Amino acid sequence: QVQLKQSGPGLVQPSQSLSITCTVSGFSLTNYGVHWVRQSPGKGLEWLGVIWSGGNTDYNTPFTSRLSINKDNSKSQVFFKMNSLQSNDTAIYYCARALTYYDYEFAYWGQGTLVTVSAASTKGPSVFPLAPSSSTSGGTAALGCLVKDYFPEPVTVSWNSGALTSGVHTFPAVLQSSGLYSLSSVVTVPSSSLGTQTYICNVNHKPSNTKVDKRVEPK
Amino acid sequence: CQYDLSTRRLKC
Amino acid sequence: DILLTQSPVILSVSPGERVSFSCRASQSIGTNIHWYQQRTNGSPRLLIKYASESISGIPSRFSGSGSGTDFTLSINSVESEDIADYYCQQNNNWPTTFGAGTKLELKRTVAAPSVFIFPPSDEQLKSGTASVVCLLNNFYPREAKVQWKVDNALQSGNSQESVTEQDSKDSTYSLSSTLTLSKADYEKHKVYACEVTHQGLSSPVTKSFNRGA
Ligand SMILES: *[C@@H]1O[C@H](CO)[C@@H](O)[C@H](O)[C@H]1NC(C)=O
C-alpha cells in the first residue's frame, strides 16, 4: 500500500526556517516524483514544488529563493526546507505523489503538517474532566474532556485508545484572549454503562510532547 | 470562503 | 498563472438529489483538469482526472465533464457522506493551480439539540479559573442561541462557542459553549444556568446546577 507519512506539527519563529520530512512506503523514490503542496487561509491550495525520480527539482516561482527539496532514496525520505517564514506562511504542508512518475494528478497524500509561524512559545495543555451526572437524558449520558490553554495547534484526542468512536465529538479549537487555544471533546454513552465501563480521553499535544490520559468518571 | 486551520474545512 | 473560478462558493442539497460543481478557467486548458474531495480533518482525495476519467475506488456516482474553459463535477445522487469541499486543479499550464473550492452542505429535517451542562472540575479550581460547559448535541439547522445566567444575572462577553462541521452519518451539528469565570467569582455564586434556543425546541430548554453539589 502506498503511504506518505510526514513529520509532526511545528512552531516556527518568524524569519526562521521550516523543515519537514516525508517518509514514503509502498513505492520507491527512484520511480516517482514527490510534490509539496500547502493549504493556507489566504491562498488555499498552492503547489510549491517537486523532487523527481532522478533528483531534479522544480520550485513554484514565488518560492525559488527560499525553498529547497532533497531526498534519501535508500531511506525513503524526502526533505522539505523553506527559509524566512512570515505569518502568512502559517498553513498545512502536504507531500503528495501522482498516479504516474511524470504527472501531477495527486492520488496519494501525506497526512499533513500544520505549521505555525509565531514568536510565542510552546505550551502544553491541562486536561480537565467533563463529568456526567443527572448530563443524563432519556438514559443517555454525556461526558468529555476539557483540553485547555495550549500552543500552538493542534492537539489530538481519541477515546479509549481508538476503541470508542461512536458518539464522539471533538470540537474545533478556539483561540482565547490569552493567546492560548482551548477545546472540548465529548461522547454520549448509555447511562447504565458508567458502572461497568472505563472512559479515558487520550490527549496528545506533540509540539510540547504533552501526552496525557484522563479518566472521566461521574462525581 | 477560506480554509480554516482549526476546523480543517472551508469556512464561509 | 491560470485562474480557476469555482461556483458557487457553497451548495446546499438534500440526499438523493443531483448536484453540479462548476470550475471556469481564465483561458482554454483543454481537458487538463482534475477534481478533489476534502473532508473535515482530511487530505484532498482524487475524484476524477482529465475532466472525465474515473479513479480507482471512487463511487460511480461521481462524474465529470467539460473542455476548454468550462468544467463540471457531478454527483448524481448525493449521500450524507459526501459532505466535503470540492476543488478543481488545472495542469495545462505551469505551474499547476487550484480553485478556491465549493463547500457542500446537506439539508435534513429539523433536529432539536439534546442539552447537557458540566460544572468546573475540582482539579481546575486549583488553578484559580473555572470553566462551565454547555453541550448542544446532534441538532439541525446550525443556528442556535446559548444564554448563560449566574444567580439570575445575564452573562455577556465571557463565553465562547465552537461548532462541529456536519456529521457524515446524520448531517447534524453539535456545539459547545464554555463560560469562563475566575475561581473567586465562581465561589461567590450558586445557580449556574444554560438556556438554549433553537428552531427544534418549542420553548427554550434550560440546564442548570447549584455549585457545591
Ligand atoms: C504573504 O506576504 C507576501 C508579502 O510579504 C505576499 O506577497 C504573499 O502574497 C502573502 N502570501 C499569502 C497571503 O499566503
How close is the nearest chain B Cα to the Cα of C44, in Å?
Answer: 11
Record the cell numbers describing residue C207, joined without a space: 440546564
Record the cell numbers describing residue C108, joined without a space: 435534513
Closest CA relative to residue C86, chosen from C99, C69, C95, C71: C99
Is B12 in Cβ contact with C42 (below 8 Å)?
Answer: no
Same domain, A59 and A140: no
Closest B-chain CA to A114: B5
Q: Where do runs of H (alpha helix) occur along chain C?
A: 122-125, 183-187
Ligand 1, atom 1: closest residue by C-alpha:
A88
The CA distance from B11 to A198, in Å, is 36
The CA distance from C2 to B5, in Å, is 25
Neighbour tally for A2: CB within 10 Å: 11
Would you say C6 and C33 are in contact if contact means Cβ atoms under 8 Å apart?
no
Neighbour tally for C69: CB within 10 Å: 16
Atom of ligand 1 minimally distant from the CA of A62: 7
How close is the nearest chain B Cα to the Cα of A134, in Å?
Answer: 31
The CA distance from C71 to C33, in Å, is 8
The CA distance from A164 to A155, in Å, is 18
Quote the DSSP letter at residue A197: -
A77 phi, psi to nearest 5 deg: -115, 135
Number of structural domains in chain A: 2
Altogether, the residues listed in chain C come to a count of 213
Same domain, A102 and A138: no
Among C118, C158, C179, which would you mutate to test the A interface (most chain A Cβ atoms within 10 Å of its Cβ)?
C118
Would you say C108 and C139 are in contact if contact means Cβ atoms under 8 Å apart?
no
Which one of A100, A118, A136 terminates a domain?
A: A118
How close is the nearest chain B Cα to the Cα of A154, in Å?
Answer: 8
Ligand 1, atom 2: closest residue by C-alpha:
A88
The CA distance from C174 to C129, in Å, is 25
- CATH number of the domain within which A201 lies: 2.60.40.10
Closest B-chain CA to A42: B2
Could you tell me whether strands A156-159 and A77-82 are parallel, antiparallel, or unpaired per DSSP bridges? unpaired
Same domain, A106 and A147: no
- Residues of chain B with Cβ-Cβ distance to A174 below 8 Å are 6
Rg for chain C, CA atoms, rounded: 23
Closest B-chain CA to A90: B5
The CA distance from C180 to A146, in Å, is 12
Same domain, A15 and A68: yes
Query: Which domains are delineated in chain C?
Result: 1-108 (2.60.40.10), 109-213 (2.60.40.10)
Same domain, A43 and A109: yes
Q: Is A146 exposed, middle or buried (0-12, 13-18, 19+ CB in 10 A)?
A: buried
Record the cell numbers describing residue C11, joined without a space: 451548495
Helix H or strand E encompassing A181: strand A181-190
Is A109 in Cβ contact with C117 (below 8 Å)?
Answer: no
The CA distance from A107 to A100, in Å, is 9
Same domain, A13 and A101: yes
Q: Using a CB–CB cutoff of 8 Å, tell me whether C100 touches chain B.
A: yes
How close is the nearest chain A Cα to the Cα of B7, in Å?
Answer: 5
Record the cell numbers describing residue A63, joined without a space: 518560492
Is A106 in Cβ contact with C137 (below 8 Å)?
Answer: no
End-to-end CA separation in angstroms for chain C: 64
Closest B-chain CA to A43: B2
Would you say C99 and C9 are in contact if contact means Cβ atoms under 8 Å apart?
no
Same domain, A162 and A183: yes
- Domain, as residue range, for A57: 2-118
Same domain, A82 and A114: yes
Quote the DSSP letter at residue C199: T
- Residues of chain C with Cβ-Cβ distance to B10 below 8 Å are 85, 101, 103
Which one of A118, A150, A172 terminates a domain?
A: A118
Q: Using a CB–CB cutoff of 8 Å, tell me whether C38 touches chain B.
A: yes
Closest CA relative to residue A175, chosen from A118, A132, A130, A131: A118
Torsion, CA C44, CA C46, CA C47, CA C52, rounded to 10: 130
Same domain, A52 and A11: yes
Helix H or strand E encompassing A136: strand A136-137
Helix H or strand E encompassing A107: strand A106-109
Same domain, A7 and A107: yes
Q: Which residues, at least 6 apart from C94, have a Cβ–Cβ distance to it below 8 Å?
A: none
Resolution of the entry in angstroms: 2.5
Which of C87-111 are b and which e, b meaning 16 or more Cβ less than 10 Å from the residue's Cβ?
A: bbbbbeeebbbbbbbbbbbbeeeeb
Closest CA relative to residue C111, chosen from C200, C7, C13, C210: C200
Atom of ligand 1 minimally distant from the CA of A89: 14
Per-residue 3-state assignment (H helix, E strand, C coil) for C95-120 = CCEECCCEEEEECCCCECCEEEEECC
Could you tell me whether strands A67-72 and A77-82 are parallel, antiparallel, or unpaired per DSSP bridges? antiparallel
Same domain, A17 and A40: yes
Tell whether ligand 1 has an atom less than 6 A from the beta carbon of residue A215. Answer: no
Quote the DSSP letter at residue C17: -
Q: Where do runs of H (alpha helix) occur along chain A?
A: 193-196
Which one of A92, A118, A144 terminates a domain?
A: A118
Ligand 1, atom 11: closest residue by C-alpha:
A88
Record the cell numbers describing residue C200, joined without a space: 427544534
Atom of ligand 1 minimally distant from the CA of A43: 14
Tell whether ligand 1 has an atom less than 6 A from the beta carbon of residue A43. Answer: yes
Closest CA relative to residue A43, chosen from C145, C100, C191: C100
| AA letter at C100 | A
Torsion, CA C148, CA C151, CA C155, CA C159, rounded to 10: -50
Would you say A17 and A84 are in contact if contact means Cβ atoms under 8 Å apart?
yes
Record the cell numbers describing residue A181, joined without a space: 487555544
CA–CA distances in Å: residue C175 to residues A22, A106, C103, C166:
35, 34, 20, 11
Helix H or strand E encompassing A128: strand A126-130
Instruction: Report how far Cα C176 is from the mean position of its chain's Cα atoms.
Output: 14
CA–CA distances in Å: residue A63 to residues A19, A105, A212, C95:
15, 21, 39, 12
Record the cell numbers describing residue A201, joined without a space: 480521553
Same domain, A6 and A114: yes
Ligand 1, atom 3: closest residue by C-alpha:
A88
- Residues of chain B with Cβ-Cβ distance to C7 below 8 Å are none
Record the cell numbers describing residue C42, joined without a space: 482530511
Longest dimension (CA), chain B: 14
Longest dimension (CA), chain A: 65
Among B3, B6, B8, B12, which would you mutate to test the C interface (most chain C Cβ atoms within 10 Å of its Cβ)?
B8
Would you say A112 and A93 are in contact if contact means Cβ atoms under 8 Å apart?
yes
Between B3, B5, B8, which is nearest A44 by CB? B3
Closest CA relative to residue A97, chosen from A38, A47, A44, A36: A36
Which residue's entry shows cell 473555572? C130
Beta strands in chain C (DSSP E): 4-7, 10-13, 19-25, 33-38, 44-48, 62-67, 70-75, 84-90, 97-98, 102-106, 114-118, 129-139, 145-150, 153-154, 159-163, 173-182, 191-197, 205-210
